[PDB]
């Protein structure tokens, strides 16, 4: 009914409010952008969104982002002249983020060249409070990009190409962030989103069709970025897959509140995400690339290939770690679920809103846990498929030592109950018999 | 066709319940299909009602499969998907039984031979194929239920072959 009233006025009220949100002054602009952000969210019809696009206000708002490069340069100062600009920027990025959540909105933003304009901004290359502020800029920009494209339609795949162009245009800053040994959850989120974007954008099919006008070189640049992504992705196994896991989880125990608990939860999220995406990427590369099947060169005795064995050892070790943690997280989630309306009454003996917030915290727990679940399901699957075909190939073509190590670890895979609650929530068991067939091919191969 | 399908899918994404609106849009199509063709061959009409249900069931199955397990928002859509499946299979049942009962009424016209020299089963059944108004129909119910189970591909089958190769 509210939308019918907004329409009823005609494109007249929408034009005046949207124009004033663009270039009014300070407060009014911020509030007008917030209002636009809120109205576009309840725009099921998406009429307001159509008007903004047809009247050119959306383009003006996107063009106005180039204005903040000078503001950011002035802000990196110890003393800030006015935080008003930061709030306008936030309202603006919030509104754009809302528009990007729409399947169509993401397309319209891509038509308007939002990623191209972000790629031209030099503020992203000025990595130094000031460091926190660079951090926040990065946050909004990258935000919009990733969210958009991801929630973006399958037809708009170039989204991945444009985002990759953005990552490559700022390769120094991105590599610096991927090399930063930071236990902060934020850094993990940055890494999770970036690894997700790289997993979808860095398809060797995008580098071959990019040779039409950029040509022999654009391919090398593409291969170069991909090779870096590969090395940085493998380095993550030593950080998150080694004895340093306990130190990252212990330095945050000097102070663990509900906040710290959830932080660790999403640290696990990252661990999960950053790589599910990377594993997906590996699987996709193998199914299309097929692991250099055409090449007859021995895979096992510039890069190195024991790297594969290391990765195998590491992934086999990480699997058990992830599995134990996943199982522990599920128990905590079950305990949180146990708590009823009766628990709120016991607390009262506000207790009710304590339970409102309690439910909040516990459902955040649920989120993180289920996330972890899917993550590890996928992890297992990947390890398997890979190792399976790997050893298939190896067979014909060291083998005794590998087989002995494999048999010992495989027995020790005990859990060796593979579970069935995530599986009972998910559809059919592709961990069961698909994994069982993988075991017949591999454990039997080890035998 | 790809532009019209994208616009309709995008319009339904603006409705507060895409499942309820997808059920409502079929009401005129069901009436139209009932009216359209002649009374003498309604069957083709029922086969078209089944096809219309199957089209929306296929769409709703794609929607329900894309949803992350645990959103209470899709419980109503999953119930409507089941009810539309029940509608589709009820049309299939009506087509099978009313064709067959109608077939006996307008076709058991020819006849007639009592017993056979052979004790062979085939000859006994060919002679008694006409003669039972209960049996034939019981086998049509079996064939109908076997057709439902055939449509219902539980499909780990190929991966089940992967699960245990002939070996």
């Amino acid at each position: 009914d509210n939308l019918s009233i907004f329409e009823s006025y005609g494109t007249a009220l929408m034009e005046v409010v949207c124009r004033d949100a663009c270039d009014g002054h300070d407060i009014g602009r911020m509030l007008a952008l917030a209002l636009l952000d809120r109205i576009v969210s309840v725009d099921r019809q998406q009429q307001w969104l159509l008007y903004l696009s047809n009247s050119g206000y959306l383009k003006v708002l996107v063009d106005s982002l180039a204005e903040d490069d000078v503001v950011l340069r002035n802000l990196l100062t110890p003393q800030p002249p006015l935080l008003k600009a930061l709030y306008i920027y936030e309202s603006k990025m919030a509104f754009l983020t809302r528009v990007a959540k729409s399947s169509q909105g993401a397309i319209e933003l891509l038509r308007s060249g939002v990623i191209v304009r972000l790629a031209q901004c030099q503020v992203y290359d000025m990595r130094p409070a000031p460091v926190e502020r660079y951090r926040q800029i990065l946050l909004p920009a990258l935000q919009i990009c990733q969210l958009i494209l991801t929630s973006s339609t399958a037809q708009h795949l170039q989204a991945a190409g444009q985002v990759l162009q953005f990552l490559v245009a700022h390769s120094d800053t991105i590599q610096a962030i991927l090399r930063s040994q930071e236990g902060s959850l934020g850094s993990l989120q940055e890494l999770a989103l970036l690894t997700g974007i790289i997993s979808k954008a860095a398809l060797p099919g995008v580098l071959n069709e990019l040779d039409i006008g950029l040509n022999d070189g654009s391919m090398m640049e593409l291969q170069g970025h991909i090779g870096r992504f590969q090395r940085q992705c493998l380095a993550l196994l030593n950080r998150f897959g080694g004895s340093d896991r306990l130190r990252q989880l212990s330095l945050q125990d000097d102070s663990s509140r509900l906040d710290g608990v959830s932080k660790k939860d999403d640290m696990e999220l990252a661990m999960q995400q950053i790589c599910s995406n990377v594993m997906e990427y590996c699987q996709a590369l193998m199914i299309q690339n097929s692991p250099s099947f055409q090449q007859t060169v021995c895979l096992f005795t510039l890069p190195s290939l024991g790297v594969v064995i290391h990765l195998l050892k590491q992934s086999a070790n990480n699997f058990f770690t992830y599995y134990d943690i996943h199982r522990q997280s599920v128990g905590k989630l079950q305990n949180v679920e146990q708590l009823p309306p009766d628990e709120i009454k016991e607390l009262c003996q506000s207790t009710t809103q304590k339970y409102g917030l309690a439910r909040r915290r516990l459902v955040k727990l649920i989120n993180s846990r289920a996330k972890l679940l899917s993550l590890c399901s996928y992890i297992i699957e990947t390890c398997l498929y890979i190792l399976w075909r790997h050893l298939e190939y190896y067979l014909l073509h060291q083998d005794v030592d590998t087989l002995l190590r494999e048999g010992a670890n495989s027995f020790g895979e005990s859990l060796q109950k593979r579970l069935l609650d995530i599986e009972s929530l998910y559809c059919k068991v592709r961990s069961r018999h698909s994994f069982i067939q993988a075991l017949v091919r591999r454990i039997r191969g080890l035998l | 066709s790809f532009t019209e399908d994208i616009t309709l899918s995008a319009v339904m994404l603006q409705e507060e319940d895409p499942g309820e609106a997808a059920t409502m849009s079929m009401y005129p199509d069901f009436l139209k299909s009932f009216l359209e063709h002649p009374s003498s061959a309604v069957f083709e009409l029922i086969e078209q009602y089944e096809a219309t249900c199957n089209t929306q069931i296929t769409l709703l199955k794609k929607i329900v499969k894309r949803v992350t397990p645990g959103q209470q928002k899709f419980s109503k859509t999953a119930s409507i998907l089941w009810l539309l499946q029940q509608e589709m299979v009820t049309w299939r049942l009506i087509a099978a039984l009313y064709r067959d009962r109608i077939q006996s009424a307008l076709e058991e016209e020819n006849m007639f031979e009592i017993a056979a020299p052979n004790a062979s089963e085939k000859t006994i059944v060919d002679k008694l194929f006409q003669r039972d108004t209960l049996v034939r129909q019981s086998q049509l119910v079996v064939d109908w239920l076997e057709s439902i189970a055939k449509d219902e591909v539980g499909d780990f089958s190929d991966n089940i072959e992967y699960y245990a190769k002939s070996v």
């Binding site: 599910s276 995406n277 997906e280 699987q283 199914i287 899917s374 399901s377 996928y378 699957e381 998910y426 559809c427 059919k428 592709r430 698909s434 | 499969k65 894309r66 992350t68 499909d155 780990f156 190929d158 991966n159 992967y162």
Partner: peptide
């Protein structure tokens, strides 16, 4: 959605 797509691919395998 990505996890669901991977599960569907595994089922197809």
């Amino acid at each position: 959605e990505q996890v669901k797509q991977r599960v569907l691919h595994t089922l197809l395998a």
